[PDB]
Amino acid sequence: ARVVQGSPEVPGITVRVLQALATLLSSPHGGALVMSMHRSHFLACPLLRQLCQYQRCVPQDTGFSSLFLKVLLQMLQWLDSPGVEGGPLRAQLRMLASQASAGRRLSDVRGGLLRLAEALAFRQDLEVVSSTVRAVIATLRSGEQCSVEPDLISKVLQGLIEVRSPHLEELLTAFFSATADAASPFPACKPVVVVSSLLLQEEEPLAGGKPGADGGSLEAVRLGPSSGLLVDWLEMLDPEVVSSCPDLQLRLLFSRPSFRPYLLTLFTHQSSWPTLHQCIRVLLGKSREQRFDPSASLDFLWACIHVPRIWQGRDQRTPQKRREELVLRVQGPELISLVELILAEAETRSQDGDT
Amino acid sequence: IKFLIRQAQGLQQELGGLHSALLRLLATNYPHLCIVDDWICEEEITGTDALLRRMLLTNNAKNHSPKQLQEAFSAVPVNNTQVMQIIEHLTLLSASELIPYAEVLTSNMSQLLNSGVPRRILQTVNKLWMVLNTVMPRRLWVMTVNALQPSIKFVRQQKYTQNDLMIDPLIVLRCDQRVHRCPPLMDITLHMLNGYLLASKAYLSAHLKETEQTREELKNALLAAQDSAAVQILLEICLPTEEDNLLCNLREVQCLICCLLHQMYIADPNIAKLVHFQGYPCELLPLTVAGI
Amino acid sequence: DPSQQFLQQSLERVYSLQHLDPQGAQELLEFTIRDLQRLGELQSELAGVADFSATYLRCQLLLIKALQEKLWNVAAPLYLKQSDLASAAAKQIMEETYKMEFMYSGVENKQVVIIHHMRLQAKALQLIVTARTTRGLDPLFGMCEKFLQEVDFFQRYFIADLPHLQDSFVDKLLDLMPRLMTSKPAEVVKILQTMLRQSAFLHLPLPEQIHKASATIIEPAGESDNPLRFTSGLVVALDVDATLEHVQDPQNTVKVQVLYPDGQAQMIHPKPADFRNPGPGRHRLITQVYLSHTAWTEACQVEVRLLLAYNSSARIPKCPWMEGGEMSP
Amino acid sequence: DANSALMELDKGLRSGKLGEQCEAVVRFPRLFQKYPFPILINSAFLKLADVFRVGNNFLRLCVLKVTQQSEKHLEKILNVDEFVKRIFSVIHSNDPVARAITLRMLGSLASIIPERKNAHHSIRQSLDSHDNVEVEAAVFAAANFSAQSKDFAVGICNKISEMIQGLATPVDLKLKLIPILQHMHHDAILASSARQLLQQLVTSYPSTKMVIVSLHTFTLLAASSLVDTPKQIQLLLQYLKNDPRKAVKRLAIQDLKLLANKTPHTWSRENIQALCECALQTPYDSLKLGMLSVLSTLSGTIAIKHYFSDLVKLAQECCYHNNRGIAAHGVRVLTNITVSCQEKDLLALEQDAVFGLESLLVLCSQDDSPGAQATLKIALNCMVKLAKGRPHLSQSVVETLLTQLHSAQDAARILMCHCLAAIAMQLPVLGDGMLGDLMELYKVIGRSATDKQQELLVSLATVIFVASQKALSVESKAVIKQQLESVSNGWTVYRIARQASRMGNHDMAKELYQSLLTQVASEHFYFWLNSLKEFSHAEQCLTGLQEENYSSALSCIAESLKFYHKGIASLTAASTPLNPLSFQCEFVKLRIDLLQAFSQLICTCNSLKTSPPPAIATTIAMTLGNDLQRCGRISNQMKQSMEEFRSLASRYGDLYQASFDADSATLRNVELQQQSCLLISHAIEALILDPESASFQEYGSTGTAHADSEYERRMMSVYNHVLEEVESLNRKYTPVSYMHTACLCNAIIALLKVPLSFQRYFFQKLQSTSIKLALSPSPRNPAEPIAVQNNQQLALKVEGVVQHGSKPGLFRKIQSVCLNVSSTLQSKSGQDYKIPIDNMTNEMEQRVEPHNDYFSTQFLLNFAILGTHNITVESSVKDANGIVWKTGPRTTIFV
């Protein structure tokens, strides 16, 4: 009954009130036959009939489907999408279904003003899900994403992000290390729903130093909510804090923000002893450049002296109050710079007063 | 037998006398497995347990077969970016899915402390060994003994299966000697040393019953001398160098050794007297008194 | 003041959201009662008004649950048993109104007239439940005339604030009562029932009221066995009671109940000479209690408790049930 | 018997024998479960404290595990001070493992000692100790003691704050210390301080695990302290809309789900609008699925009524999604909105509802996967709710169900049959319409089925019996043919016969019972099947009555009574001490007595014509008699019938409260039977006798649209007919019962129209609860009375424990046990009874409310009789709503 299938579909779409159950049963039988893969040559005929009915009537039919009978049209669209997703044999009826969905969307975007996305929402979602193709360049996508972000666009930015994610999931090529920071800053500034996925794709299989880029982003861009996410990238791909660049990490830890105590605890309980001693001797050294915050330096030193690994299982609180033996030895100029910065930072007195 | 003990203790409604008799036999035949500090960390603390397991195991822990971690360990890119997050994301398991990962964790602990390694990786390896000590601890101890080898290009004694290792636990103290400046590996070796000392005590107690088909005083003297030798070796490990004293791996290792010595003295108050009658260098006197 | 604004929001939510299904209203009342009880258990200075509102909402919930009983959905003249949950709920509602009226101190005339209207509605519900099962038509006249007499007494005692309350059960009954005095009590109680179903839900005004509770001072409080030595003939021993807090002149108002293990129960009257008030807002009750009974052959238990007094007669459980010493005679 | 076990455990614990000691310790919980007595539990806990005071550090862990396991048996300890002292005497040792075990033990005892200052000081001191396991044990004990003990909370909050903000502890220690702030709901100041601390921790420690644990603690505090729940919801929505991570989003989704599960009334319109706007901007599928699950949980409460247009658009958009779970959640939201809300345009949404159901039927028909069966069950129960809450669309769903029944490979037809049976319980026209299609499916289903043919056939037979009303046509023979040559599974045909007897079909029940009588693998089940067959035969013969017939009606009543006697005899022949049948015997006996009373009534109504007027007229003129109008010998028979009906109603009310385990259907059936009995009693009292006695008109509504069965509706219609025929003939004729006996007999025949309905409690007796009620009197092993001085006193010391063989919170919950006690004289004093007053004054009705599964009261009595007495006690458990629930333990002691 493939010849009268288009007529039956048109009758059920316009006014039948009875053929809806028959169409649903036929769609269910076709889906079951496609799942069983027992020579299910029925979906192609239904797809061709639907394409012919949409090509014959595209203005009044779409309006009647989006205004009068929306439930049956949405159910038929869902069944067609399920059949196209299950029966993936060389994507025979996939192109025709995509073309029909695009034609229906183009007809409903101008002729359906009152019923705004009432029944065409499923078709739009299916078209957006089917448009997630893979880029064939994987090198110039960063410039396109930056242009879309600068042009203040939402759908274009989402499409660019999806294309970049698909290119990253595909065969990795020589990625650029120039516009990646700008793209990350734009995605952090603008409301991006796939910002975490984009960051993971850009820092998963890139041929560059993602740690320096993440540090520069966290130090320059004012990312409010996503900052913590960057903090994750500071503890996932960077085991030691002072591992790649000491100056930038020292400036990020001790400066002239919000994630400061967490990173301080990480550097205290996750760094090796030579690196810790090096940081202590370079921080407490004689330097008037104000390259270290004493407010964090004091409790950093207090935590390094009271590391729980230094006191593993000895008796609790049994020292000699006359003189402490276990101490941290320092040098002359080191202690001089320490007392200098201590007496210097204790002169602000914004609201503390005198006591 | 430890996995069976755990899965029998997990079923307390049924299996009335079976689990009871199994535990009463484990407490007598295998005293080296009934160590309290070995399987006490599995108790609830604040309910935060299994929370990160239910909230951080859906998007990952699905394509991390042991072969991937194995090939990530040994490679020209010896960078610790991927292996770190890989070994960190699998710490949320229920200590029963780490059985295929135990073989990958072992045989690479000696290669771990080669040069320039971070601190979090060693801590995660120690935590994994601790959560893998609650199940199949004997095979894990054997694998860790066979993994921590001097690697001097010549094979002297290999694989230490169950006899040449449980007879004299001192083999756990003749390792690569590079783990002495490594707090996590040192704690692992101390746990193995205590377990193997208890296992040797049990083995001698069982062997003096399967013979002559006095000897008890000889066994007691041998056990006392073995404990004293272990304590002396642990004390000599606390020496600084061969030629800061507060902020270094030496401090943490000395503290762990003092903790193990305190546990041994609490277990038996006679080995302390025997060690003091044997004596040790004075450089360790202000450390043991203020540490034990 | 987060607690005050939260209480105001809860009260306005209970007041406004009332035109819905009966099950929805019931579950909303249950949720709000639980929330008010939690707030009273948590907050201290705002505990009195919270407990007052919680008790009022519990009264309303029990009322709306009694009105939705299956007896009206089944045959009326049968009334086999355990079919109307209002036969035992009317007494609870009356006790709750008595407690809300007498236990709290900072009450306003609006609260008094609202609680009297609630008591009248409870009496009408009791009348309906009794007439639903009463077989003799002669006793119906007696209780119907009694209820009309109570209604007349209420409307004579309360003259003001009547035009303030709109669409309420009291005003509807006052406007319809000139006609209900000419027919049979059967149709009278029928009209009373069909009117009380969707009458109204009056809003209660909050105030700075506080509860009236006691303490558990160590004077003859819970302790070890400590079996004292005494005989069966004369009195066993003497004990000391506990202190009081926010009782609004506990003199001639607070009783002391003694619940023996036997069926007998003694309520010793208070002594006005021992009531001390050096802590206005907090009190103290040091009164000797007399205990005596025949031999017990054991040291089972004893129960001493404090209660309240009313105009004619009633009791209020204020303090937690505190057991006394064994004192085996 | 428990004394011997305690003694042998003590002997095992005497010697060292570490293995034997561990064995005894791990066996102690079994002794606790076997004997919940307080004295034995106290002695065992004292022995555990003794073995905990001195040990080899391994018995301490076993005792800790035993204490953590047996937590409900912890409050029933008499000597608490000595136990706590023996437990705490080992925390002063220098062994960190011993101190950690002691801290964990103290934390396990945080429900019996929340004010011991020594434990608080120990936890405070050992919280910052130089260790690793002792610190964790101290944290555990601090959380336990901060749950209760507001003083410990206010004393430990500052220390927890400093220990977390000291930046000198590892990340794991902070992640373990954060959940301690959950138990800060004791005061408003504590809640505010914990809220500020958690806000500072979130704004200062940005990390996945850190933020997750801190948000969990914050939401647990907000849920346990319902003062700032709107702020919690606003913060969760802000983090859903701003935070780009995926773990935090799922955490917030589960958070909103828990909040809607526990406190759904605190939500507002703005929160729902924000959640819908956030779900509309989610490109992922799992996140949208979780948000829609939260929305479906919210829409099942008063939140959907307070919200009333973004939620409607979201539900309409996600109703036709590709995935199945999202579509199921969408159609659930739509069905809940349709049932709860009653807007004007929402009627059109009803269309989008029913067709939307199809979107959940063509995708989970032949999938054979739990992920599809879950959505199928969701859609089916949603359709059931829509059909039971709105009968306007009862056919528009049953037609889709019938059309979809043909599109399943014998996998989803069981669920469809369950849905059809659940829907057809309200309206019988659906069954009348779908009986033909059900029979067609039953005919075409007997071709081949191996996987689950049994359950499929059972469901088909059940839905057929529900749809049918008579089952006397060819359909019965067709079912018999389909069940005969097919697989003859005894359980399948037994369940089919049980469902047939439940729905009222007795011919098929009798046929299946006769077929099963020849294949029984035991003797008790043989008598059970024989009794069921006899009952079904008597039911079937009872339906052989004709309207306006009195000649053969007596013969039918006699043969039904004979079959009932045979059945009850064969049933009581199967009553054994192991699993005794108490409800069935009483139910059958009371039914037999009711039918015998009906037979006596019809016999008296027939004999009324046998010269009854001139019988008693020889002693007094019955005509125009103001004392006794129409005085005849029939008055004695009428009074006997009235008192018999009153006794039958009393026994029905007793059987209602004697079960305590029956379902709603069985209780409703018993209530309907008692109502019919009381109606017949009222008819024989007010109509046949003088109408001036009561003269009470039943001017009230009845038979509301709430019956969940056709039997209940038929009984209510018969009740209404009897009332409307008795309210008019009250003051019409003379009381000689000229036309009153006619309508009385018509009502009797109408009551016998519906044969019976054996409800669910008649079989598969579940929820077996029992109160032991093991008092502790003077030691009396023999039956000899306790020697008392007869003048001092006599104590009882009664105590009972509740035992539930099944799930306790299934149908009713035990709240109060109204213990009663009475005394009487055993030996005959002057008459056959005890005495003139029987000494039954000592009642002492006490009402104890057991918080746990244990209660103990004190009873006394005073008697001055030198003879032997009898003391009996009764449980009389009380439920939540409040019913006597007369239980039958019958614990009787002489003295």
Sign of CA dihedral D405, D410, D415, D419: positive
Instruction: For residue B56, list chain A residues with Cβ-Cβ distance below 8 A.
Output: none
Determine the residue of chain D that is closest to B13 in CA distance.
D30
Taking any CB pair shorter than 8 Å as contact, residues of chain A touching chain B are 236-240, 243, 269-273, 276-277, 304, 307, 309-314, 325-329
DSSP per-residue letters across D14-38: HS--HHHHHHHHHHHHHHHHH---H
- How is residue D478 written in tokens? 């067709």
D383: left (phi over 0), alpha (psi -120 to 50) or beta: alpha
**CA A71 vs CA D319, D350, D697, D777: distances in Å:** 10, 11, 54, 75
Would an 8 Å CB–CB cutoff place B115 in contact with chain D? no
- Angstrom distance (rounded) from CA B218 to CA B224: 10
For residue C265, what are the β-bridge partners? Answer: C259
A341 and A297 Cβ atoms separated by less than 8 Å? yes
| HEC assignment per residue over A290-305 | CCCCHHHHHHHHHHHH
Tell me how close the Cα of B24 comes to any Cα of chain D, in angstroms: 4
Alpha carbon D542 to its chain centroid, in Å, reads 34
Tell me if residue C77 falls in helix, strand or coil: coil
Across the interface, of D57, D133, D212, the residue whose CB is closest to B55 is D212
The CB density around residue D235, as the number of other CB atoms within 10 Å, is 19
- Cα-based angle C193, C199, C202 (whole degrees, multiple of 5): 135
To one decimal, the resolution in angstroms is 3.5
DSSP character at residue B38: G
Tell me if residue D195 falls in helix, strand or coil: helix
Across the interface, of A239, A240, A312, the residue whose CB is closest to B259 is A312
Alpha helices in chain B (DSSP H): 2-9, 16-29, 51-55, 66-73, 82-89, 99-105, 109-112, 119-131, 137-147, 163-166, 183-207, 216-237, 249-267, 269-278, 285-289
* Residue type, position B116, single letter: G
Alpha carbon D462 to its chain centroid, in Å, reads 24
User: Among D325, D346, D422, which Cα is nearest to D383's?
Assistant: D422
C302 and C324 Cβ atoms separated by less than 8 Å? yes
Tell me if residue D373 falls in helix, strand or coil: helix
Contact D355 A21 (CB under 8 A): no
- How is residue D293 written in tokens? 């699950």
Sign of CA dihedral D343, D344, D350, D353: negative
Contact D859 C261 (CB under 8 A): yes
- Angstrom distance (rounded) from CA A40 to CA D135: 66
Chains A and D touch (3+ CB pairs under 8 A): yes
D795 and D857 Cβ atoms separated by less than 8 Å? no
Across the interface, of D228, D699, D858, the residue whose CB is closest to C261 is D858
Would an 8 Å CB–CB cutoff place B279 in contact with chain D? no
Tell me if residue A320 falls in helix, strand or coil: coil
| HEC assignment per residue over C95-156 | HHHHHHHHCCCCCCHHHHHHHHHHHHHHHHHHHHHHHHHCCCHHHHHHHHHHHHHHHHHHHH
Query: For chain B, which chains pass the contact test of at least 3 CB pairs under 8 Å?
Result: A, D
Contact A75 D169 (CB under 8 A): no
- Angstrom distance (rounded) from CA D448 to CA A142: 62
- Angstrom distance (rounded) from CA A230 to CA A214: 6
Chains C and D touch (3+ CB pairs under 8 A): yes
Query: What is the total residue count of chain C?
Result: 329
DSSP character at residue C284: E
- Angstrom distance (rounded) from CA C302 to CA C326: 6
Instruction: For residue A301, list chain B residues with Cβ-Cβ distance below 8 A.
Output: none
Contact D340 C75 (CB under 8 A): no
**CA D399 vs CA A18, D395, D404, D587: distances in Å:** 12, 6, 9, 40
Query: For chain C, which chains pass the contact test of at least 3 CB pairs under 8 Å?
Result: D
E strands along chain C, which residues?
Answer: 213-214, 238-240, 243-245, 254-259, 265-268, 275-279, 282-285, 288-290, 303-308, 322-323
- Angstrom distance (rounded) from CA B28 to CA D16: 12
Size of interface C-D (CB pairs under 8 A): 135
DSSP character at residue B209: T
Chains A and C touch (3+ CB pairs under 8 A): no
Query: For chain D, which chains pass the contact test of at least 3 CB pairs under 8 Å?
Result: A, B, C
Across the interface, of D265, D843, D881, the residue whose CB is closest to C31 is D265
Helix (H) or strand (E) holding D782: none
Would an 8 Å CB–CB cutoff place A159 in contact with chain D? no
Show which of residues 159-198 on chain B sit within 8 Å of chain A, judged by CB atoms.
183
Helix (H) or strand (E) holding D768: none
User: Among D718, D641, D650, D651, which Cα is nearest to D687's?
Assistant: D641
- Angstrom distance (rounded) from CA A289 to CA D230: 49
**A231-236, long-range: CB < 8 A, 24+ apart:** A231/A259, A231/A262, A231/A263, A231/D206, A231/D207, A232/D207, A232/D208, A232/D245, A233/A199, A233/A203, A234/A263, A234/A266, A235/A266, A235/D207, A236/B84, A236/B85
- Angstrom distance (rounded) from CA B147 to CA B141: 10
Chains A and B touch (3+ CB pairs under 8 A): yes
Show which of residues 100-119 on chain B sit within 8 Å of chain A, judged by CB atoms.
118-119
Tell me how close the Cα of D38 comes to any Cα of chain B, in angstroms: 22
User: Among B176, B117, B120, B168, which Cα is nearest to B144's?
Assistant: B176
Tell me how close the Cα of D702 comes to any Cα of chain C, in angstroms: 5
Secondary structure percentages of chain D, helix, strand, coil, to 5: 60, 5, 35
Q: Do strands D855-856 and D802-804 pair parallel, antiparallel, or not at all (unpaired)?
A: unpaired
User: Among C99, C122, C101, which Cα is nearest to C170's?
Assistant: C122
- Angstrom distance (rounded) from CA D535 to CA D526: 14
Residue B124 has φ and ψ, to the nearest 5°, of: -65, -40
Contact A328 B80 (CB under 8 A): no
Tell me how close the Cα of B211 comes to any Cα of chain A, in angstroms: 42
- How is residue D633 written in tokens? 């010998």
Tell me how close the Cα of D200 comes to any Cα of chain A, in angstroms: 10
Determine the residue of chain C that is closest to D341 in CA distance.
C20
User: Among D375, D384, D372, D399, which Cα is nearest to D336's?
Assistant: D384
Instruction: For residue D662, list chain C residues with Cβ-Cβ distance below 8 A.
Output: none
Secondary structure percentages of chain C, helix, strand, coil, to 5: 45, 10, 45
**CA B57 vs CA A41, B93, D251: distances in Å:** 42, 9, 13
B56: left (phi over 0), alpha (psi -120 to 50) or beta: alpha
Instruction: For residue D348, list chain A residues with Cβ-Cβ distance below 8 A.
Output: none
Tell me how close the Cα of D786 comes to any Cα of chain C, in angstroms: 13
Chains B and C touch (3+ CB pairs under 8 A): no
Burial class (CB in 10 A: 0-12, 13-18, 19+), B89: middle
- Angstrom distance (rounded) from CA D343 to CA D337: 10
Experimental method: cryo-EM
Q: Which of C80, C83, C137 to mutate to test the interface with D (most CBs of D within 10 A)?
A: C80
| HEC assignment per residue over D488-555 | CCHHHHHHHHHHHHHHCCCHHHHHHHHHHHCCCCCCHHHHHHHHHHHHHHHHHHHCCCCCCCCHHHHH
Tell me if residue D226 falls in helix, strand or coil: coil
Tell me if residue D770 falls in helix, strand or coil: strand
DSSP per-residue letters across A32-72: HHHHHTS--TTSHHHHHHHHHHHHH-SSHHHHHHHHT-HHH
- Angstrom distance (rounded) from CA A296 to CA A255: 9
Query: What is the total residue count of chain B?
Result: 292
- Angstrom distance (rounded) from CA D341 to CA D335: 10
Would an 8 Å CB–CB cutoff place B287 in contact with chain A? no
Helix (H) or strand (E) holding D859: none
Helix axes B249-267, B183-207, angle to 10 degrees: 30
D860 and C296 Cβ atoms separated by less than 8 Å? yes
| HEC assignment per residue over C180-193 | HCCCCHHHHHHHHH
Tell me if residue A218 falls in helix, strand or coil: helix
Tell me if residue C218 falls in helix, strand or coil: coil
Give the residue carrying structure tokens 């819908």: D276
Across the interface, of D58, D179, D247, the residue whose CB is closest to B55 is D247
Helix (H) or strand (E) holding D820: strand D816-825
Contact B252 A309 (CB under 8 A): yes
User: Among D700, D676, D698, which Cα is nearest to D750's?
Assistant: D676
Contact D130 A75 (CB under 8 A): no
- Cα-based angle D458, D461, D462 (whole degrees, multiple of 5): 85
Give the residue carrying structure tokens 């601790």: B130
Would an 8 Å CB–CB cutoff place B51 in contact with chain A? no
C145: left (phi over 0), alpha (psi -120 to 50) or beta: alpha
Which letter, b or e, does each residue of C294-303 get, where b requires 16 or more Cβ atoms within 10 Å of its Cβ? eebbbbbbbe
A26 and A80 Cβ atoms separated by less than 8 Å? no
Across the interface, of A25, A229, A262, the residue whose CB is closest to D205 is A262
Contact D171 A266 (CB under 8 A): yes
- How is residue D85 written in tokens? 């002292």
For residue D778, what are the β-bridge partners? Answer: none
Determine the residue of chain C that is closest to D228 in CA distance.
C2
CA atoms within 13 A on the CB side of D386: 30
Size of interface B-D (CB pairs under 8 A): 83
- Angstrom distance (rounded) from CA D573 to CA D534: 14
- Angstrom distance (rounded) from CA B204 to CA B218: 11
Across the interface, of D264, D702, D841, the residue whose CB is closest to C76 is D702
Burial class (CB in 10 A: 0-12, 13-18, 19+), C241: buried
